[PDB]
């Protein structure tokens, strides 16, 4: 052919003096993924943790610290009025340490009040009428739930000159010796929210929950009675889904029992409500997943991460 020795991309000199004009070059495959620009990446699960953290802040909640993968049995259990007969304080369920076996320092006064009400009762309750062994509470372990963190937080609060209502939240990792599985792992992330004021009602707990799951884009909300060792009334919240074409549990909550709170020193006119869920569940659905080990852990498929989108363009009109 004639004038057909096409060129490549334009040039700074062609742009300098008329050269680009007629030196024929029109080749560009307008149907190709082009070159994804090299880009940094944030892990999907944490992109989500971020979104939760925000929801909490927008709802006036303060972020409580969780720097302690290792909790003493006292704070992780006893403190939450979790008897010692319970099947969750067993070796086959929890990770107890081998090296720092027993903890070192413990809040003996508070511990005394617990030991007490735990076995003999008080504050209006009739305890569990069993013998509370301190050597047991001394046993160190791997925090089994963020609720312990709240116990801490509340206790600290109970010491403030005059009481002052608050709203705490925290999204932290929690170790469980459950069962090496494909559905659930050994360690996951659990988010918890707690409100402490005067005269909070089960309805409040419900009201807050509705507001929370709305900023998560959920309206099909139905509550159901449940049981938690550390909550006067306790309820599991559910939502409807098409995936299992029927109702599903999306969160557990309750109203800390007074035999948990009163011994910390909080006033009797103060009541605190709380709720919690796992960072995992909401992702393993609102992003469709088969194996959890696919995004949590070293076995993670990095390619999936590179491609993970704005896991926050979620609670928006999807």
């Amino acid at each position: 052919t004639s004038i057909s020795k096409q060129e490549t991309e334009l040039s700074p000199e062609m742009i300098s003096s008329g050269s680009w004009r007629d030196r024929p070059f029109k080749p560009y495959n307008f149907l190709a993924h082009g070159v994804l620009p090299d880009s940094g990446h944030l892990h999907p699960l944490l992109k989500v943790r971020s979104q939760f953290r925000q929801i909490f802040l927008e709802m006036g909640f303060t972020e409580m610290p969780t720097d302690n993968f290792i909790e003493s049995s006292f704070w992780n259990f006893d403190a939450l009025f979790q008897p010692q007969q319970h099947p969750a304080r067993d070796q086959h369920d929890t990770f107890f340490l081998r090296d720092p076996a027993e903890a070192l320092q413990l809040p003996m006064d508070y511990v005394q009040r617990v030991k007490r009400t735990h076995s003999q009762g008080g504050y209006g309750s009739q305890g569990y009428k069993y013998n509370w062994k301190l050597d047991e509470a001394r046993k160190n372990l791997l925090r089994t739930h963020t609720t312990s963190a709240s116990a801490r937080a509340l206790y600290r609060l109970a010491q403030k000159k005059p009481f002052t209502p608050v709203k705490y939240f925290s999204i932290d990792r929690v170790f469980r010796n459950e069962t090496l599985d494909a559905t659930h792992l050994a360690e996951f992330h659990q988010i918890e929210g707690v409100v402490a004021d005067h005269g909070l009602t089960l309805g409040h707990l419900m009201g807050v929950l509705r507001e929370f799951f709305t900023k998560l884009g959920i309206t099909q909300l139905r509550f159901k009675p449940a049981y938690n060792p550390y909550t006067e009334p306790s309820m599991e919240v559910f939502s409807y889904h098409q995936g299992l074409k029927k109702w599903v549990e999306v969160g557990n909550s309750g109203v800390f029992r007074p035999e948990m709170l009163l011994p910390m020193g909080l006033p009797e006119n103060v009541s605190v409500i709380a709720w919690g869920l796992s960072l995992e569940r909401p992702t393993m659905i609102k992003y469709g997943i088969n194996n959890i080990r696919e995004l949590v852990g070293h076995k993670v498929n990095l390619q999936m991460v590179y491609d993970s989108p704005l896991c926050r363009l979620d609670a928006e009109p999807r």
């Binding site: 990446h41 340490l97 027993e102 608050v166 089960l202 009675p225």
Partner: protein
């Protein structure tokens, strides 16, 4: 999560209605229960033997109901039916009265040899039970149900049911040397000794647990009677002589154990549950238990507590404003027979021995709300203004995360647990110089220790992503545990920002450059003078010599910057060389 299987057709018949698989799944929800699953006996084993089509009682459909580990009066069909029945006011709640018998004031005597192995025990009898194929199995089931559950595998409380027509005269509870009691146990051919059964059971799949987990002391609990017949050896097995079968007329129930009140309760549950089948319905025949103390107390003590609650409390706590008269109605449907006390202010509540879960005022509120139906409670929103605040550290973290990403790196999610070799041997150091924390009786090998660094996990990630393009640039900003003699628990978490460069050539200069950016981001000037930071060449057993440095800033060692040593990179089954970086962002707040 206690589960209770029940023959459907029976359950429905028991109630007095027929339910849709939805209608009931609903009723369950409405009462705090959950209809876990619906199967047949054949389907139940249709996977534990392949498919050995077992036909018989596998034709019947049964509901697998889940019940709260709180409510004990719901561990058998008799109970669930009674509970739901009153809950829907389809029946008045029955009253349990214990009566005196006609002279046969059965009595069980506790001795001194007792208090030190199973301190106390309690018993009672229920006259003329009309048993049944099912009623029997249910009675046995309940027994097992609350055994390895509320009794903690008999550890605290152990229950024994006997056929009172097959023995007589005052019974005795005591303890003798193991090799000092002949016996004809439940499912055993001959007649053995205590000292003999113990080891012949170490092979019994079922009792393999209960035994040693409770006995190996100088004495063994035993229960005799006038004749001298052995009733049972409390925690392990009962006597085959006094065995109880479908045709039993009178049952003598005994409960021994280390926890008084619990035993006392277990008894009440059993006896209160099945007295529905006694000739004199809902009646338990008293029994006299005599303690080493020499005193005699009557049992069971069907405790009927009568606390009082201000209707206002229930309202103000649940979040409803119903009238005291109606509040009482609610509570009643829940077994707690309530009645308003004149000035329509206070409500008198009667706590049945069946609901032993009610231990505090708040527990009444629970039941009250459950009876009222959670979804009938209007959702209100707490009106207390509070200014939100992030936790300093986490705020900073969240920021750095966003810039690491800007700097082209990709965030991972390492596990916090692993094997010692992951944070020691594979890095060229002994597990004794890591300050690491050790987990007791770890399942797998990768549950021995808790992270001491993020480098391992990061590498392991690369290992699993060999399939990924040219240079891998990973990073993570998480916690690592260390033993700290100055913390109430004994260990402390630290926030490390750790990154790695994986490529044909290690990017030690580009990694060095990352640290520079990071510092630039944190507004930390370089050099020893300007109160900033310094890279001081150093040596590390995990880094290729002469390509390793230490980071110093704000008056202390922050981290280690360097090129991974060929040994570690191969011991983590990797190909290319590697440049790392790991600073403790803590001091930078």
């Amino acid at each position: 999560m206690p589960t209770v299987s029940v023959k459907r057709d029976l359950l429905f018949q028991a109630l007095g209605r027929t339910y849709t698989d939805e209608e009931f799944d609903e009723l369950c929800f409405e009462f705090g229960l959950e209809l876990d699953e619906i199967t047949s006996e054949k389907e139940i084993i249709s996977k534990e033997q392949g498919n050995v089509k077992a036909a018989g009682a596998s034709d019947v459909v049964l509901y697998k109901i889940d019940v709260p580990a709180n409510r004990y009066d719901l561990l058998c069909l008799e109970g669930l039916v009674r509970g739901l029945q009153v809950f829907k006011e389809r029946i008045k709640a029955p009253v349990y009265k214990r009566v005196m018998p006609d002279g046969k004031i059965q009595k069980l005597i506790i001795t001194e040899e007792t208090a030190k192995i199973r301190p106390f025990a309690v018993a009672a009898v229920l006259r003329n039970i009309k048993f049944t194929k099912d009623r029997y199995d249910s009675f046995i089931e309940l027994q097992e149900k609350l055994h390895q559950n509320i009794c903690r595998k008999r550890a605290l409380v152990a229950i024994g049911t006997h056929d009172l027509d097959t023995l007589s005269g005052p019974f005795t509870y005591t303890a003798k040397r193991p090799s000092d009691i002949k016996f004809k146990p439940l499912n055993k051919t001959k007649e053995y000794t205590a000292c003999e059964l113990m080891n012949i059971y170490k092979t019994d799949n079922h009792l393999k647990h209960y035994l040693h987990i409770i006995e190996n002391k100088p004495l063994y609990p035993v229960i005799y009677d006038s004749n001298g017949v052995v009733l049972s050896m409390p925690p392990i097995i009962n006597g085959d002589h006094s065995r109880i079968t479908v045709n039993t007329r009178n049952i003598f129930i005994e409960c021994t154990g280390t926890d008084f009140t619990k035993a006392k309760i277990v008894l009440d549950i059993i006896v209160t549950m099945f007295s529905e089948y006694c000739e004199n319905q809902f009646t338990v025949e008293a029994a006299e238990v005599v303690f080493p103390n020499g005193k005699s107390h009557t049992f069971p003590e069907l405790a009927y507590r009568k606390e009082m609650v201000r209707a206002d409390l229930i309202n103000k706590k649940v979040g409803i404003r119903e009238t005291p008269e109606n509040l009482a109605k609610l509570l009643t449907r829940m077994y707690l027979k309530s009645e308003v006390i004149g000035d329509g202010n206070q409500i008198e509540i009667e706590i049945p021995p069946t609901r032993a879960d009610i231990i505090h005022a708040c527990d009444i509120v629970e039941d009250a709300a459950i009876a009222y139906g959670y979804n009938n409670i209007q959702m209100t929103l707490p009106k207390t203004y509070t200014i939100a605040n992030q936790f300093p550290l986490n705020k900073l973290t969240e920021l750095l995360r966003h810039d690491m990403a800007a700097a082209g790196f990709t965030e991972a999610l390492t596990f916090a647990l692993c094997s010692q070799e992951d944070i020691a041997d594979k890095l060229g150091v002994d597990i004794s110089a890591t300050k690491a924390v050790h987990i007791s009786n770890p399942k797998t090998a990768e549950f021995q220790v808790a992270r001491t660094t993020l480098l391992p996990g990061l590498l392991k990630t690369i290992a699993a992503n060999r399939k990924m393009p040219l240079p891998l640039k990973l990073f993570e900003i998480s916690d690592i545990v260390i033993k700290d003699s100055n913390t109430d628990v004994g260990a402390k978490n630290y926030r490390h920002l750790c990154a790695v460069y994986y490529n044909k050539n290690p990017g030690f200069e580009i990694i060095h450059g990352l640290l520079d950016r990071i510092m630039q981001l944190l507004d930390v000037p370089p050099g020893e003078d300007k109160g900033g930071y310094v890279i001081k060449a150093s040596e590390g057993p995990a880094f290729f010599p002469g390509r390793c440095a230490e980071i110093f800033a704000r008056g202390q060692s922050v981290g280690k910057l360097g090129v991974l040593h060929p040994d570690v990179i191969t011991k983590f089954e990797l190909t290319m060389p590697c440049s790392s970086l790991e600073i403790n962002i803590g001091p930078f707040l």
